[PDB]
């Protein structure tokens, strides 16, 4: 009479769990290397009626996996590549004076050196244009800025660094829960839950200050600061609309090739065709104003609505966070975005051209054990992108709930991964289970 507990199988159970993500893609590019398995055009989402699930942003380790997965790729792409250590020979230089726009003066140097031919016994004079950013004076003549740091390398310019979406799929017996709620706070339960066995691609693209090409917020601009009272935390900001940005590298770039050993081509910058001009970026002025108004409305959700909000010029620190940077067009750029923050907000022609800079020696991420040369790319660079959000920080020590101010900040790439990954969590399916029954086992 008394109930017997008995076996059932395949009953849904969720456990929070972590497994290694499986890479997949639509259909050489560094980001996919074409090694990711191609995947089916069948995003068969399953709405989960009557369920809710906790999701905690900044707790998911998919973010961490992505963060190190891309690093491993980056190194993998460079391990085949030729070392540039012959370039630590000191250089004679002059400031370039040929057709220089006045605000470009001293930006480039023409320099030369006694570096070796591919023959073991011979040397040749060599010269190239260089950005001033990539060199330091040998004494109060120049040397590459990284010769006192781990060695510079570069080869294999053919590989593309343009972003390609990357998809991640749960291992069999696991699934990816997602939250569709347009109002979702970075943490806690979500009523909108549905699931997929895999996810839509996410681009590897990075920025040091503003999110680029991210998914738009579903309803309204949103902010995810974690516990906002702690101002050491980065403030995520997600636009619910795109902001177009155009940029250029107006100089007509040309290329030179050098042999530094057998089989070892070395890229060098040819003289620019035409007048030298600064790299720049155009954004709508009006749109920038409008979207800031959307942002401050969001900020006020945590404050009295008559509070003062301010934006500011960057507080400095390392250039990689002091300025906005991107690899669009296959070449690195930096810009002075501080003009974008020259405003304050109170209760109650059509565009801007930001100045920019180019550095060819890239020290990736926070690492100091590696550096690489970026090859010149011939012609004018053009770039078009959608700005989809901001990485912001807030000054500590404010009082009387007013005059809060903000600056661009962060630059840990992990937060970029989070801007997309907050939508998902990985769970483990535990099909096994039991329940009481009126049944007792049959006689043998």
């Amino acid at each position, epitope marked *: 009479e008394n109930l017997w507990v008995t076996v059932y199988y395949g009953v849904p159970v969720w456990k929070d769990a972590e497994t290694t993500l499986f890479c997949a893609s639509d259909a050489h590019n560094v980001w996919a290397t074409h090694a990711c398995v191609p995947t089916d055009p069948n995003p068969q989402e399953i*709405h*989960l*009626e*009557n*369920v*809710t699930e906790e999701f905690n942003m900044w707790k998911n380790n998919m973010v961490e996996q992505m963060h190190t997965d891309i690093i491993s790729l980056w190194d993998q792409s460079l391990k085949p590549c030729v070392k540039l250590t012959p370039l630590c020979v000191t250089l004679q230089c002059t400031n370039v004076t040929n057709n220089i726009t006045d605000d470009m003066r001293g930006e480039l140097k023409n320099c030369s050196f006694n570096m070796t031919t591919e023959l073991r016994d011979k040397k040749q004079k060599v010269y190239s244009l260089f950005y001033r950013l990539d060199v330091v004076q040998i004494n109060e003549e120049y040397r590459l800025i990284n010769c006192n740091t781990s060695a510079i390398t570069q080869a294999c310019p053919k590989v593309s660094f343009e972003p390609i979406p990357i998809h991640y799929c749960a291992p069999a017996g696991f699934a990816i829960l997602k*939250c*569709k*709620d*347009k*109002k*979702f706070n970075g943490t806690g339960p*979500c*009523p*909108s*839950v*549905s699931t997929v066995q895999c996810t839509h691609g996410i681009k590897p693209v990075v920025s040091t200050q503003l999110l680029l090409n991210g998914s*738009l917020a*579903e*309803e*309204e601009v949103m902010i995810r600061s974690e516990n906002i009272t702690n101002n050491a935390k980065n403030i995520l900001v997600q636009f*619910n*609309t795109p902001v177009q940005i155009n940029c250029t590298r107006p100089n007509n770039n040309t290329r030179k090739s050098i042999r530094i050993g057998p089989g070892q081509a070395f890229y060098a910058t040819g003289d620019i065709i035409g007048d030298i001009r600064q790299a720049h970026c155009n954004v709508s002025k009006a749109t920038w104003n409008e979207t800031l108004g*959307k942002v401050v409305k969001q900020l006020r959700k945590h404050f009295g609505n008559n509070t003062i909000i301010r934006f500011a010029n960057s507080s400095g620190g390392d250039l990689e966070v002091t300025t906005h940077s991107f690899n669009c067009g296959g070449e690195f750029f930096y810009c002075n975005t501080s003009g974008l923050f020259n405003s304050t907000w109170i209760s109650n022609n059509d565009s801007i051209t930001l100045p920019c800079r180019i550095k060819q020696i890239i020290n990736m991420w926070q690492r100091i054990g590696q550096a690489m040369y970026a090859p010149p790319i011939q012609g004018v660079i053009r770039c078009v992108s959608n700005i989809t959000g901001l990485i912001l920080t807030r000054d500590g020590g404010s009082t009387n709930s007013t005059t809060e101010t903000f600056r661009p900040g962060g630059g840990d790439m992990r937060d970029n991964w989070r801007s997309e990954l907050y939508k998902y969590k990985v769970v483990k399916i535990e099909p096994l289970g039991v329940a009481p029954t009126r049944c007792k086992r049959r006689v043998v």
Partner: antibody
Amino acid sequence: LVESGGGLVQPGASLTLTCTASGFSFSSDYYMCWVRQAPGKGLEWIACIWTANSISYYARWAKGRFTISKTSSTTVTLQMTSLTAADTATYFCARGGSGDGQSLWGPGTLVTVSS
Amino acid sequence: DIVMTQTPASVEAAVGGTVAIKCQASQSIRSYLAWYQQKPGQPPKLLIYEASKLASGVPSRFSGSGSGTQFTLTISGVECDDAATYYCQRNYDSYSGAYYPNGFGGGTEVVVKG
């Protein structure tokens, strides 16, 4: 809010209704929705649009035949095609926030589909 | 998607009585449920949003309760002005995660005995 565009139309016709805002605008973000009600029957949701980005949601019977659009800072439209007698109804537009019902409604415009 | 079932379809109450109107959701919508009053020939009027919050200018004899799957509109002390049809409305969408106001219940007619 005031709806406009209703009247008598023949089966098979297309029609566009407009919802016009006065005293406020889409400088603030809202869901603007269309709801209909046939004579003697209940309220039937058609569609909502989030005015910040024109993202739209549709009833299963409306998507593919009705289209909601934000056409200005004070107007939202409902384009209707392949109308039948069963589409005869008062059409209302309404304004809601996120999660907080619809506090503002128009008086409705009457669409009659008949031979 | 989610179906909203409203009961009873009609109800009679004496002036001064209490009347309770129920609305069932087939999937949980937590608290995202609104209630409307409609007089013949008028557009509907918001009474309650988020299951129990009173809208501006609505008499205190209206109240709402419930959460998840089951909700109740209570009129405590019915008046002749309350003779109307009442609708619940789902205010959350499980597929998209968004909180726009969408599908209605079938409606309940309240007749008032004076």
